[PDB]
Nucleic acid binder design. Sequence first.
RNA 1: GCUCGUAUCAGUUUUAUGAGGUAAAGCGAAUGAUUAGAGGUUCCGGGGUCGAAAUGACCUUGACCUAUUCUCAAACUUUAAAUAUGUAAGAAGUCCUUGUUACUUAAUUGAACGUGGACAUUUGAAUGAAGAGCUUUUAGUGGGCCAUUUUUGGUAAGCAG
RNA 2: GAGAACAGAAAUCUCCAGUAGAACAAAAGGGUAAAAGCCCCCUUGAUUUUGAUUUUCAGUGUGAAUACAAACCAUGAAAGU
RNA 3: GGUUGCGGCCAUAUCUACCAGAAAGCACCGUUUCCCGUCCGAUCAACUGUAGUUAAGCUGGUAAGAGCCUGACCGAGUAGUGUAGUGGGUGACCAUACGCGAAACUCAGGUGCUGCAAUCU
Lengths: 159, 169, 72, 294, 58
Amino acid sequence: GKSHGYRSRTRYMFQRDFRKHGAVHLSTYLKVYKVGDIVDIKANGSIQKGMPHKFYQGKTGVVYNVTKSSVGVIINKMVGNRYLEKRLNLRVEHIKHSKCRQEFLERVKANAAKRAEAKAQGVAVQLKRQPAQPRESRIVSTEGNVPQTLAPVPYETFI
Amino acid sequence: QNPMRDLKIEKLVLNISVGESGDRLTRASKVLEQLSGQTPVQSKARYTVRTFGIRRNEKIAVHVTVRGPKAEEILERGLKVKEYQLRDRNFSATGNFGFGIDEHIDLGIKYDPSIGIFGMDFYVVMNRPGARVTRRKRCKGTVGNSHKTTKEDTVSWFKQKYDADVLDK
Amino acid sequence: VVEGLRRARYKFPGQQKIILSKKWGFTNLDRPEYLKKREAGEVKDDGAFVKFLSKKGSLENNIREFPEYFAA
Amino acid sequence: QKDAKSSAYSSRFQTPFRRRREGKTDYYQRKRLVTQHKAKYNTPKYRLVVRFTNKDIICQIISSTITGDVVLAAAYSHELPRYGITHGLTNWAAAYATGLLIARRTLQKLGLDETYKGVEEVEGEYELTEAVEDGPRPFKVFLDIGLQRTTTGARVFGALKGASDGGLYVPHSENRFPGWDFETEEIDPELLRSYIFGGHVSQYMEELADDDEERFSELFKGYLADDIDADSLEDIYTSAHEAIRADPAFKPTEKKFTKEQYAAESKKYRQTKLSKEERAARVAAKIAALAGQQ
Amino acid sequence: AKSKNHTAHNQTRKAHRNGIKKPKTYKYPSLKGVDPKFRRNHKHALHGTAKALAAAKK
RNA sequence: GCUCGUAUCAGUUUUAUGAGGUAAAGCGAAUGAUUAGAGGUUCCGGGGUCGAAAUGACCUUGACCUAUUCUCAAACUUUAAAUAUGUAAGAAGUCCUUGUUACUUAAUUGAACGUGGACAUUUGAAUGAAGAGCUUUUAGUGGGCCAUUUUUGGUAAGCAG
RNA sequence: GAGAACAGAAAUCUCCAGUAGAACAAAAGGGUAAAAGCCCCCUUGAUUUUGAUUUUCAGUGUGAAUACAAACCAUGAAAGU
RNA sequence: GGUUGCGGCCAUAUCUACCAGAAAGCACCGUUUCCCGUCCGAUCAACUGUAGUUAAGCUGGUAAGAGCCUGACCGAGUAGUGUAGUGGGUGACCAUACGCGAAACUCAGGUGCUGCAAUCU
């Protein structure tokens, strides 16, 4: 008979770590999550209450509720031909903030700084990001760097 | 270089192990208590083996731990009974030692016909200041190599005190 | 030994090649390299295989072993 | 060699936290004490940490952050004699005095000194710092004993009672104070008052003077030198209490010296690291002498 | 007379015909499932805010 | 059909940030399997020669460390890809007034919501958008099969999955 | 591993080493070391009310349940649980 | 700079051996009247810091140390892998084209940093 339990096929996924077993460091309990914060889900195998499902393992959501030792996270899950909004009551041990959102907020603050600078003098700030442009022309010297000619090597057993 | 490294008796454990329980066990606990001046602790069985006629949780043995001058005097009685002849093989590699005697009346206990004859083994655990360091709750530690006891040091100490020699083998 | 390996090839399935290894015997060192180490002292024979001297480790342990390399 | 730990064992060994392997903190209770209700987002959780060594009593008020725990107020038995208890700087009465000192110190620091005056007519009755109507709530701190064994009549609970009487709202029960009976679930106010004001020490001094002059002269030497007796010790305990209630401001010292000279002396007497070139020279000399036969 | 048991063939195509478009988001999401203590407090605070705003712009 | 004009978008990429234990690799790293020595074997075991005395001697099994050594693992693993995969790239946003609260704080401390103000043709990556979005109702279908890759059982099958 | 008269390969006692190689009702996989293991003390939160949520799912039901709320309790010095 | 209390990251912090430690800051103790707990003031509890050692817990330093971290145009653009062909080959498998890209090995370096408070020739 087939087996599809709550923690089915979660052996290595919920495997704790290598040389990171045991108690958890208290930074995780010290972190503060407010409503609207984007957070990453990585289940902790040593904590068994508030554990997320293996589907939500590795997903990212928005905090919508805060409780004593937990946080309500909203995840859009693809069910068939649409995403449904699932609400999870996860614990702070399993939950973790989003460096991507932190970086975006830092970029927003910087962007505002450059716009203020432009309003100060207007030096064509170009707020937006640009992709990797093709490299322009350059002149490379040969003094001290005379080209060393290479040739394909003959085959040898090397055993 | 020996401020506090001098040996001192940590404790003496008085142990008897009776093959069965019941009247023998309680009377032997009674004589051990009367000899030691304090109530002893009963030790159960750890598993079951048919040859010894024992089963799990049977109260196989009784033992006591005595420390201080009473331990020292009980040791003096033990060496007197044992003729102060001990063995290098008898001495352990961790610095502690011990030996077993029979007919506890030899120690100087008034013979009660009820209790009868009961042998017992004395084990002396020995160290220097620092036992608190090794077994205190806060900041557990281990004593150093120089501060650790050893067999040669303890045979030298045991000879020098009481002038009781040990046979070479 | 080439002919014996040819006969073993006959016994075996598939396609097999016979290669004259450039390493010294069953070691993993080329013959000049083993020769130089053995004229030197980083190589010392065990019963079947060979023991090698390490630039890292306990110097006194190497010296109680590998005496020829240091005193040669 | 039998005493040879395997490379695989040393590789797979997972060391505990540094304080755990130093045997200083219990991270179980530390988590239970530091973990804050997430609905109270950045509200600090304040611990009254009490620590006892012979010759020293440490009482601190600490909140916890990501970069480390930060100290709010601190009181020390080593500066207690400035307030007026010279001897017995690590007893139950000294713990009570230090708790009173830290409570008054933090109340003065944070502005809750006038309100929540504590208890001035101290008798030993078990009571908590109730909130005053139409006013601020009392400063709430939770006791932190670390690895110290919780038991009846302990100096940790002496400091607890000292802070509670000083005015800090410390949630606690009276079944651990000296004077609480196991058989009869009622605390003895007279016995607790005696323990607060050094009644057990006074009793010991009187009985030693009555029975054994030898020990009473070998020790209690400071009391004999400063002419202190059973009633005078209670008097000086009360005077220290009132002085603490008067000036808990924690006047500091100029250290009579300078950190620069402290560092210079410690550095010159300390040992120095060995450079990589020096290590290479050392192994070269070792191969030259031990291995190369000079 | 055995038959095919299960397959995921054609399923992604059928989904993507008129499928995986994102769900529509709203300002002021539903306050259901949040802490009822916070709900009571937010109700009272909103009532007070509306009263104060009307007083400010009578 | 309805509400709406260059839309709250995307089977795509980029930047930033997560998750994975498969391929590979590894076993002088854990577990399990496995070849061969050599060194020291004296805490029980086997026979031979010193041959009437024990830890007075040697060869073996090896109560057992290496310089070790040859091979492996779908239900082993420190490490660990590629392809896939979750988010974010703002106006429902960013900064001063804390205005309300019966929540919370030792505390006009925080939490949530908000009033006043500042931000234009780089409103905060690329590409595209053939009009976004939304509702009702109903047909047929609910025997599938076949490539290339991954892959299971089987000797294999125009076999079965 | 060493040591203690019966006592020896296995009875009880004592040191030393011991990253878990033990145990946690069961099958396997995770998880746990001042514990989630062993022992000791108290205890009934295995209580009431009806909501929200996850998992198979049609986002229907059954089975388990993750987080709360309003009470009443247990335990602990307390944080909390 | 030393030390203590509370810690953050949790071995660059662990483990083996040895050497050093002025002054401050746990010590064997004097102790068991009281609180308390054990067969045993060994653990725990309590009162004196007084006659007294750097014992050595602790810290620091040293090992061609084990381990553990950090790198490399060392291994190696190799194993593997996405995409393509009416490519090779009986096949097993292999090469090429557009991309991504390991681990083990081999060298080299390092052997705790740091926050709050208090204190120290």
